[PDB]
Amino acid sequence: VLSNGLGFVDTPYKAGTLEVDDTEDLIINCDEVDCTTFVEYALAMALCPQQEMQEGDFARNLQRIRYRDGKIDGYTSRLHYISDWINNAVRQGLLEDVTAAYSPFKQKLSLSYMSTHPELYKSLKNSPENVAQMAKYEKALSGKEVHYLPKDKLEPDGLPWIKNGDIIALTTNTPGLDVSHMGIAIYIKGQLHLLHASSKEGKVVVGKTALSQMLKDRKSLTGIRVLRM
Asked: What is the DSSP track for 33-51?
C-alpha cells in the first residue's frame, strides 16, 4: 500500500540482498532494497491487521509472498519470475488481478532467461539441479496467457480504474522475460507516477516522469499489469 511504500522513500537500492547466505531462508532487509523486495516489504506490511504492526504478522506475510505457496525450500522455492510471483499472490487471494478484470489485451508468457544464463546467478552457476528446476518452472509458465494494458492505452493522467497503491508490473518483450520492473502507483499533480526502487537513482523514489512516458521511452517495454491488495 501507498502509505507503507512511502515510508521507504530514499532507502538505498542494492541488488542481491537476498543472496548473501549459503542456504536459503527468510531474509528481512528493509535498509537496502531492489525493485521486487521493496514491493514485497510494502505489501507484507500493508496486509497486517495492525499498522501496532506485529513482526510475526509481517514475517508470515512476507514468507507467503516471497516463496512458492509460502514454503521455504532452497533457492528455487523463491519466486524469481514476476509472472510466477504474481500468480502466487493472486492464487492466495492476497492480490487481485485488476488488468484481468478490465483489459481485453493479452500477452503469452515466454520465460527462459534464467536457465539460458545460469552463469549470472550465484545459486545457478554451480547447480545443474537448480537450473533443471528453474527450466521446469519456466516451461510450466510459458505459453500461458495473462491480461495486460498496452502502453499505447495509458495516458500521463492514468485511468479511473488504476488507483493509488496498486502494484504496477511493467511488461517487456525482451527475450526470455515477462516483466522487467514493478512499483506502486501514485498520483502526483494529476499524473500517474511510479513509486519504485530505482537502480538509476540508486534509491526508492517517486518517479519524476509519468508512468506512460517511462513506458513509451523504452522500446523493450510493452505495457503494464495492475494488481491490487
From this structure: B-HHHHHHHHHHHHTSS--
